Design a protein around this ligand. Structure first.
Ligand SMILES: [Zn+2]
Ligand SMILES: [Zn+2]
Length: 549
């Protein structure tokens, strides 16, 4: 007896069986209903494209783990990983260094014959790039390949040509401007060991290699590494996973490492290799124009009449604001959980998101009585409408998103080194502890303090998180769905009173629930069991280790 468990590109978390008349990871053409479909054999009844498995051993292992960790259909996951042409069932064929810099290269090179996750931490253009290129030389010397990941926007032809000139070997670049013939042919070149280096973005993570020797991720902290639609994987984590299974080094490069990364360094997980005028304006009691203080505008014009350009920064868009007093600096805090109230002016109430408390919007401040209470964290209201006739550190410090401070610290540290340049911050709380750490001690000091505060609040990366989203035209009832799913999560063996669930709370826009637990592995099992059984079902998607925004 022999029968093949085949995975199909469908949103259902299961394998379909078929018969074998006279291996796993090969593509097959199978009947599916009355039509025909391409599938991939997950393991070995109507009967049934490849000679050899289309995924390498370690890439196959990686995808199998990832599907189960992100709780996404094995079918999608596998077909998402393939070149478009292979999805459709077509054939698999196509007719200088200083002291610090040197030390880094050496350190990595001395452990290059096994797994080792290095954080290359250095201020902007201290030449982290130079380390990448030298480490790659040593790996390419040995005749092993390399994967270089950049953010989506980081594949500039300047960067590309600088690589191409450095290496007398073939470099294969997966930019978004390639067609399907080209993408496939490049995928083959990597698989066959013709391509010494592969440079791409997030999806370049799944490209196969004859002998992969090292992985480089530049701008490790960047958002583009987290896929926001469909299969919500994080390319950085999976790269580190892939490096672990293949037993090769990985280099994570950032001038402003994510706190996740720094935590991993403080613990044994990663090892750090390191490389070596502002005005703070108090908005309190000021007359503002378009949220701008006189002192800023005074400084703006003196830069505009000198014929220079002026950049203003705001807090993305659609994010729900907080409420504070423009005169006295009181902020709307939830009295039960010490957390900032999110303002819902459109529904005429104040709402907590860490717990779920309602409260009316007061038209006067309860701490000093001022009528001047303002919303903070708005720049989608066309600042140009107020600027043509003629920021928001608060938005980052008093957000309902617990990550906002970290995002700001990264921005500020980036733009602090981008003549004599002038940086101006506007805030209602110039003397905020965390802000002060950032401004006077630097990013890593901010991070160390921010990270200890995350432990206090039991937030990531001290805990793991899992979001579950629901969208229903009804606006109501869909939250009942999540309430059903909430209770189904309660009793599942593994509550340990540590599992902490936020009951259905409206998104920062759409409903969702949040799951929290110190153990990553325990929270994966809890989701695995409670998801196994479900019935009704209303949109609904599953986001492990979410970036929220
Ligand atoms: Zn609360
Ligand atoms: Zn007040």
């Amino acid at each position: 007896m022999s029968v093949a468990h085949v995975a199909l590109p469908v949103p259902l978390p299961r394998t379909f069986d078929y018969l074998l008349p006279e291996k796993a990871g090969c593509r097959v053409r199978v009947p599916f209903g009355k039509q025909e479909r391409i599938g991939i054999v997950a393991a070995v009844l109507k009967p049934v494209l490849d000679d050899e498995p289309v995924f390498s051993t370690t890439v196959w292992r990686l995808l199998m783990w990832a599907a189960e960790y992100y709780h996404h259909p094995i079918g999608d996951v596998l077909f998402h990983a393939l070149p478009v042409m292979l999805r459709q069932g077509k054939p698999a064929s196509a007719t200088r260094l200083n002291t610090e810099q040197a030390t880094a290269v050496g350190a990595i090179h001395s452990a290059a014959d096994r797994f080792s996750a290095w954080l290359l931490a250095g201020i902007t253009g201290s030449g982290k790039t130079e380390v990448y290129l030298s480490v790659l030389e040593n790996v390419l010397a040995q005749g092993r390949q390399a994967l270089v990941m950049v953010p989506e926007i980081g594949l500039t032809p300047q960067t590309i040509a600088r690589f191409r000139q450095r290496f007398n070997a073939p470099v294969e670049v997966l930019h978004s401007g390639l067609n399907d013939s080209e993408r496939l042919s490049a995928w083959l070149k990597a698989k066959n060991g013709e391509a010494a280096i592969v440079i791409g973005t997030r999806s370049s993570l799944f490209t196969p290699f004859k002998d992969l020797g090292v992985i480089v991720i530049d701008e490790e902290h960047d958002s583009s590494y987290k896929q926001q639609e469909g299969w919500r994987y994080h390319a950085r984590d999976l790269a580190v996973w892939r490096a672990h299974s293949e037993q090769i080094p990985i280099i994570l490069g950032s001038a402003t490492p994510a706190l996740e990364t720094l935590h991993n360094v403080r613990q044994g997980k990663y090892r750090q290799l390191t490389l070596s005028q502002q005005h703070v304006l108090d908005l309190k009691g000021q007359p503002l124009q378009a949220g701008l203080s006189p002192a800023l505008i005074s400084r703006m014009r003196q830069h505009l009449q000198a014929d220079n350009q002026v950049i203003l920064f705001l807090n993305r868009r659609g994010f729900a604001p907080a409420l504070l007093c423009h005169d006295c600096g009181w902020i709307a805090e939830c009295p039960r959980c010490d957390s900032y109230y999110t303002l819902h002016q459109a529904q005429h109430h104040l709402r907590c998101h860490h717990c779920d408390s309602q409260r009316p919007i007061p038209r006067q401040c309860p701490s000093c009585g001022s009528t001047h209470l303002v919303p903070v964290g708005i720049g989608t209201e066309q600042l140009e409408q107020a600027l043509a006739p003629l920021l928001d550190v608060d938005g980052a410090l008093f957000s309902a998103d617990f990550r906002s401070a970290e995002r700001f610290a990264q921005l500020y540290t980036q733009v602090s080194g981008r003549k004599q340049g002038e940086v101006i911050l506007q805030t209602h709380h110039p003397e905020h502890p965390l802000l002060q750490t950032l401004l006077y001690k630097g990013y890593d000091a901010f991070a160390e303090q921010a990270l200890a505060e995350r432990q206090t609040m039991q937030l990531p990366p001290w805990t793991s998180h899992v979001l579950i989203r629901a969208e229903d035209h009804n606006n109501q009832q869909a939250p009942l769905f999540l309430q059903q799913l909430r209770n189904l999560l309660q009793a599942s063996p593994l509550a340990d009173e540590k599992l902490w669930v936020l009951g259905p709370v409206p998104a920062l826009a759409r409903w969702q629930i949040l799951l929290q637990h110190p153990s990553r592995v325990r929270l994966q099992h809890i989701v695995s069991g409670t998801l196994a059984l479900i019935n009704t079902l209303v949109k609904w998607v599953l986001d492990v280790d979410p970036i929220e925004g």
